[PDB]
Write a protein that binds this ligand. Structure first.
Ligand SMILES: [Cl-]
Length: 214
């Protein structure tokens, strides 16, 4: 038929009423903001901060003995609270950028100093900083590779999370079992390769590099 047309046919073989799970995209967005799912949040934040100011903030946090920069005003109060032992409310976390200029969240660093506030501030931590002390959606999110999580952030058509496949259909994502989606791959006339394990990924849908079968 066509490689891209076979992927359109692939999505039509699914029964979106007998899906193992289903998630409203707007609900998922309010429970998990992008900054708390994104792999870039765990990195030093050189895209939003100048490398020189990141150095000065880290030096102030290491010693506890306020640099002049236009962006470091919010990170500076976090450093003050950490050094002096003062409090920051959940209101503060909800209105912050959530991400510390050195990577990771403000809520995880704060909970490292006050471990008893973990339940109150868990929703402000990155999914990779949470231990899941309460969750099925959090567990699926945590087991997504960087390409699958970034494809969920972007609203991509589909992606493989472990053994299950998530497929978008409007404002929801439907999750299907390994047996159901693998048979549809053969029923459509397709082969797949994970983006992380492929040399070339020219027909990419999320975390999936599609090809024809033989
Ligand atoms: Cl897509």
């Amino acid at each position: 038929d066509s490689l891209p047309e076979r992927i359109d046919t692939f999505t039509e073989l699914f029964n979106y009423e007998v899906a193992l799970k289903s998630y409203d995209i707007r609900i998922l967005q309010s429970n998990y903001p992008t900054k708390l799912l994104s792999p870039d949040s765990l990195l030093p934040q050189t895209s939003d901060y100048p490398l020189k100011d990141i150095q000065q903030l880290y030096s102030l946090a290491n010693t506890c003995r306020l640099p002049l920069s236009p962006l470091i005003t919010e990170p500076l109060v976090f450093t003050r609270a950490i050094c002096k032992g003062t409090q920051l409310t959940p209101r503060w976390f909800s209105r912050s950028g959530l991400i510390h200029p050195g990577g990771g969240t403000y809520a995880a660093r704060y909970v490292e100093k006050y471990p008893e506030l973990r339940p109150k501030l868990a929703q402000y931590m990155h999914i990779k900083e949470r231990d899941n002390e309460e969750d099925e959606l959090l567990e699926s999110l945590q087991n997504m590779d960087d390409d699958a999580i970034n494809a969920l952030i972007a609203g991509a058509s589909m992606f493989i999370e472990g053994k299950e496949m998530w497929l978008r259909r409007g404002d929801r994502y439907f999750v299907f079992s390994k047996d159901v989606w693998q048979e549809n791959v053969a029923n459509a006339g397709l082969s797949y390769t994970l983006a992380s394990q492929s040399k070339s990924c020219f027909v990419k849908r999320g975390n999936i590099c599609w090809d024809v079968e033989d």
